[PDB]
Amino acid sequence: MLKLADLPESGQMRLFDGRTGNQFERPTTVGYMYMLKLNHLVDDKMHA
């Protein structure tokens, strides 16, 4: 499923540095993580 959609097989993408602009001499891993939202906000716990 990684190799059929024009994506690298090990998740070893080649990324570009947005801050410094120097080319990374190492392949990185990106993707999509489905995360959750919690009932641990600041507004219900803030005591003023």
Shortest gap between Cβ of 44 and another protein (angstroms)? 8
Binding letters toward another protein, positions 19-48, x by CB under 8 A: xxxxx-x--xxxxxxxxxxxxxxxxxxxxx
At which residue do the structure tokens 């801050």 appear?
Answer: 19
Choose between 2 and 30: whose C-beta lies nearer to another protein: 30
Task: Tell me the residue type at 46.
Answer: M
Give, in degrees to the nearest 5, the angle at Cα 32 between 26 and 34.
140
Is 3 a binder of another protein (CB under 8 A)? no
- Record the tokens describing residue 20, joined without a space: 């410094």
**Site for another protein, rule CB under 8 A:** 13-23, 25, 28-48
